[PDB]
Amino acid sequence: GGITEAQARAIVNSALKLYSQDKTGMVDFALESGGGSILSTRCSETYETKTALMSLFGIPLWYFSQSPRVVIQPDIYPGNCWAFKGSQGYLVVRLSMMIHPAAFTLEHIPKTLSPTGNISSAPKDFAVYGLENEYQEEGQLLGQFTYDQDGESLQMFQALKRPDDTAFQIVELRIFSNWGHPEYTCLYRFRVHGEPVK
Amino acid sequence: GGITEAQARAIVNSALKLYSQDKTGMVDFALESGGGSILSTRCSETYETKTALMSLFGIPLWYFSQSPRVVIQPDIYPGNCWAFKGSQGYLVVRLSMMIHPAAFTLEHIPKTLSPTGNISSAPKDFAVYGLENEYQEEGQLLGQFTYDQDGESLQMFQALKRPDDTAFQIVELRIFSNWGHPEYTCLYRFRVHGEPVK
Amino acid sequence: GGITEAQARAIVNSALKLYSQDKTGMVDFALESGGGSILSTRCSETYETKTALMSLFGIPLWYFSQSPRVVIQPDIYPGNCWAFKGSQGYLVVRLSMMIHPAAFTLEHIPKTLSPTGNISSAPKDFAVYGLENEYQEEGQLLGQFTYDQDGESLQMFQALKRPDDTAFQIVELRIFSNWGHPEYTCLYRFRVHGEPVK
Amino acid sequence: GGITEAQARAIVNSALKLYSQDKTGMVDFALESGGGSILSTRCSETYETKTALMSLFGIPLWYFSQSPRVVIQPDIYPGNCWAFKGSQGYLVVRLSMMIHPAAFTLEHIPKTLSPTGNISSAPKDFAVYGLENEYQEEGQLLGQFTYDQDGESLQMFQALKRPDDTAFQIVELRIFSNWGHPEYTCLYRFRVHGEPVK
Amino acid sequence: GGITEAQARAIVNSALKLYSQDKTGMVDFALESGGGSILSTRCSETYETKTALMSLFGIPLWYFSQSPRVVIQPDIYPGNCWAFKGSQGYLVVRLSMMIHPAAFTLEHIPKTLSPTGNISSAPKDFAVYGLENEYQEEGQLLGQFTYDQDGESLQMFQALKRPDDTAFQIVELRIFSNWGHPEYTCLYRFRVHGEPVK
Amino acid sequence: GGITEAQARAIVNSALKLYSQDKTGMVDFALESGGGSILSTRCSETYETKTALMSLFGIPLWYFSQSPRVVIQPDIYPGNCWAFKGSQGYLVVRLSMMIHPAAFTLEHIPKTLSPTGNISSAPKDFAVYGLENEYQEEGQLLGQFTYDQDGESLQMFQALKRPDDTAFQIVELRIFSNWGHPEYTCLYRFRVHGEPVK
Amino acid sequence: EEDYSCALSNNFARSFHPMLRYTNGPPPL
Amino acid sequence: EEDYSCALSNNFARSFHPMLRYTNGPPPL
Amino acid sequence: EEDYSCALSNNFARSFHPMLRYTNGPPPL
Amino acid sequence: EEDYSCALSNNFARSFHPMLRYTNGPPPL
Amino acid sequence: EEDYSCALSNNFARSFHPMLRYTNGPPPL
Amino acid sequence: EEDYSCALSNNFARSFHPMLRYTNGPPPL
Ligand SMILES: [K+]
Ligand SMILES: [K+]
Ligand SMILES: [K+]
Ligand SMILES: [K+]
Ligand SMILES: [K+]
Ligand SMILES: [K+]
């Protein structure tokens, strides 16, 4: 019933190898360094706090706030997230290749690293759509989901299966609710997985 | 006496989960991206080496040296540290929230990654104080400690316990000695842990 | 024959400690933050794609491509690599200290994170040389090697042993072939290991 | 019948004194340094030639063309003029004070300083209007005039007299034709004269 | 008693030759392009109006106000002057050569070019001093004078004669009163004349 | 024998009209604002004095020296000149139009405005050549001349007459000697006159 | 109509030429 | 209607955050 | 005394390293 | 006293107007 | 020879003084 | 020959990528 030292070493080494491969071992076709980009935020309003002041020699220069581009960058230390006003938001992403989308990942910080002890700014209900071109107003539904505030930091979601599989190079993420924060919603990272067209 | 494969997998997965949470699984109220900031270095002198020259088309542009802000940023590759002249230094940090401080973390690179084989620039004796406002000259002692050059890279230190627990949003780190480097002392990362006031 | 829970915990903790030390637990004398630098690319031509456009208010500003300096920086997410035209390339690196070189490391992304499923842009045959000064045209051979596209992401290579061990502070990496990409070759990270002269 | 040396000196000195007072001895309420400004050019199109290239170290930086603001600046060396496409143009000017407008000045270079020997780009038929606010589409006519290509460089024009004199702080210059240039029309300087409201 | 055409032409040509030589035909040792500079304004306060806004694409960039350096530059169109708050002001000028100062010039715009019809912002009572070094608080008096608002635009003033003539390369202009403007005093140009030490 | 007041006024007004037309009443095909440009200075060395320091907040920013372009700009206040080392210099100018060159103008400041009382930096012997293209090393001689230090500020020089008149759009000015300054030679303005090809 | 659209426009405001506007007060002179 | 105006908008494109767009080709990797 | 002057000083504020100060509110997270 | 403080000051040196100082030599002319 | 090298050179083109070149057309005037 | 010209060249030094060179001393670490 019990394992040997050699077998324990193999299990440890295999787990660290997967960890080192962006945690998942799967291509992220939204990743900015790999060819993904942010096209649009529609009518979303980036939350303007006016608290992060950059200065030199005592001279005020600029107020700093995070860009929507941080959602397709891998750092997820607290605060490395895009914040929009209210709890409804929109993000249009161009993928690095034309693919058949099969799954999506959403990450948020865990409660143990949040200074208040809660993650009420995290997204709750959301959906993903496939678009044929940047200017399409309503795309094809790829799935509707809920990010669970009592789950793990990284959560994965499976796309709907249809008898005809259409390929897309643009997707739209829509956030419909958050976990109760009354001023804003924060998005740390969104990933898109699937199979490239041959 | 022996463990099963299922039990070994659970131990591995739990260790990687803690590792991914900033190694410790505890909020760092000094972290810059999360709301902390560097207010002052008092009379400390940043070490001026004049060796890192930035150029374009062969035209010299700027000499590069690290900012005190790197002490509240998480990268700790060799050289990603703040260096001050001599072995006495001062750093005044504003926390992201008002808290009851309970513990502090100090990190330095390990000897195996230092090109000389020693870490003589690391801090040795130090203390932490709580301040009521930025312009206070002498704060309340929260503890005095020694970073052990023969210990682990990341070391944690417990604050003094008093019958009345006062809350602070500003702390001061004072370094009194180093591990023998004759020109400078290098600080890689300093963290502050505790419980936020309700 | 079987291991205890205490023994399994010790194996896991030892593996994460090595992982945290730049994966290898060995000094990298080429690392830029630690004192290494890129001196020259000889006649190599950085691949000019003209696809990554930076803009503001709809106004085009700049086309972005990666610098040769990224080869001595630790991020290896897809795209964080230096690309040169064809499959022959040159990189002259100044080390942080004068050393007796003993081994070299080359990293590339794994196939599971490459959008096409192949890594045909990876380097194949290469060699390393020691130079006495920046302007030397032909150095002393330290070894000739092949990066294996069916191996692990990180691969290590042992320098030639000679009866007289000469010290160097400049090395040259020469790439002679790639794994079949018809337009370019991509280099993610190159490291240099050894013993500093006393 | 003849004049003395003293009388000749007085005539010369009086002529140079008037010359030194902006040639005319009258306030120009459109002058930029004195408080005038350019608000708008309506649908006028600045002529885009793409011939004046600024470079440094052989690197192209910027194409230079003159701003509409040059029309209320006093330098009138050849080329120090605003050029618009075709022969219909619009310029909305805010005066330094609220005034009763009484006269206008238009300047162009003389033929003796034009390299071709003609000034076919000069304005011909034009009119001036008074506006109550910046967003008014049609103002009150203050006069219609023709710049004479066979006259002097500096020409002055008298505003219409009406039984009720209205004050204005915004005027609009409309150019309806030029002296035959087939690609553009060039304006060197426009001035506005009158009496400030008390 | 009467003059000939040849004699009249000679008088005209001689007057234009003097006019072209900076109006006076005398070296100005304060002129910036010729080697003069502004060292200090002591406790003078440049008048902050916050009315001249520079923008691009509708984005506010900078508020413009004139520098003390304009006092040693030759353009004197309305508004090309240094304005300080109140009616007491100080200007410390370093001359292009060490000289025996013999005379000073002050210019203001004439009333015919001022939009209000008055020049109440012009300086009235003033004095000039010679200083041995930049940090001297009280220099040697070279003369005290009044700019006459009913005189010519350009006025000249003779330095005091003493039995021992000391040389200076720094002078200080002190303004004690103006012609009645209640908010500021405007200085268009100040010149210094004399003989260089051999 | 004597003139009337009307005749004296006509002579004065005619002289001021010519004065206002760039002093000469003739097109300058080298003028920068009108389409001329500086192509090259060959092996001339701009005189590096390192005395004109620009600063902000006490921080040194830049040393200022005049560009060769100032030679085709009309301001000739003292110091608004191009200075080259020694007394041999070269300037290659592209004209605004293809012309038959007929005359050249050279200006220097007069002695009465020079602080030393001499103009020993002025050019003395010089020649002008016509070039067919920018890269021609030796052009066709258009004339050889001497600027007279005892003459007027502005001096004009007539091109050689040949039986066949060739047109040029590039000219080269060569300076062979100065009026004795031991360190440099200063050029204030150079003009080119003639008839454009039809 | 073309006449109505021209009044709407302000091409100088959408150019690379910087604007200088006096916000309701003459500068010192 | 509000639903129709939101599709029209793109607030990120009119912000001070610089945009990075790949013009129809993946970068080298 | 030296001990009293050090408290007065703030060399980071007079350096070429830009400062980032949170004006009394944590950023979104 | 006010008279003694004014001599100490130099407001131009702490402004946003750039300074131009000739370091002991006239420029070419 | 020195005479041949001078023709080759163009020190203005390798200086910190910006160049302004009219690419085959006079500007509007 | 091509082999001799390549040694002469340094395309990185004539690019728009800024260079960082340590002038004979390791930085603090
Ligand atoms: K992120
Ligand atoms: K750090
Ligand atoms: K890399
Ligand atoms: K003008
Ligand atoms: K002035
Ligand atoms: K000039």
Numbering used by the authors:
A (entry chain A), B (entry chain A), C (entry chain A), D (entry chain A), E (entry chain A), F (entry chain A): 615 to 812
G (entry chain B), H (entry chain B), I (entry chain B), J (entry chain B), K (entry chain B), L (entry chain B): 8769 to 8797
What's written in the study?
The SUN1-KASH1 structure was solved at 1.82 Å resolution and demonstrated a similar 6:6 head-to-head assembly, albeit with less extensive interface-spanning interactions provided solely by opposing KASH-lids. The electron density indicated the presence of a molecule bound close to the 6:6 interface, which we interpreted as a disordered HEPES molecule from the crystallisation condition. This likely provided structural rigidity that underlies the high resolution of the dataset, but was not essential for the structure as we solved numerous other datasets at lower resolution in which an identical 6:6 interface was present in absence of a bound molecule (data not shown). Importantly, the SUN1-KASH1 structure closely matches the previous SUN2-KASH1/2 structures, in which similar 6:6 interfaces were present in the crystal lattice but were thought to be crystal contacts. The SUN1-KASH1 6:6 complex is formed solely of a tripod of KASH-lid tip-to-tip interactions mediated by amino acids I673 and F671, in the same manner and owing to the same torsional rotation as in the SUN1-KASH5 structure. KASH1 undergoes acute angulation away from the 6:6 interface, as previously observed in SUN2-KASH1/2. As such, whilst amino acid F8784 binds to the KASH-lids of each tip-to-tip interaction site, KASH1’s N-terminus does not contribute to the 6:6 interface. This creates an open interface, with large solvent channels between opposing 3:3 complexes. We consistently obtained models that closely fitted experimental data (χ2 = 1.56) in which 3:3 complexes interact head-to-head with a bend of approximately 60° relative to the crystal structure.
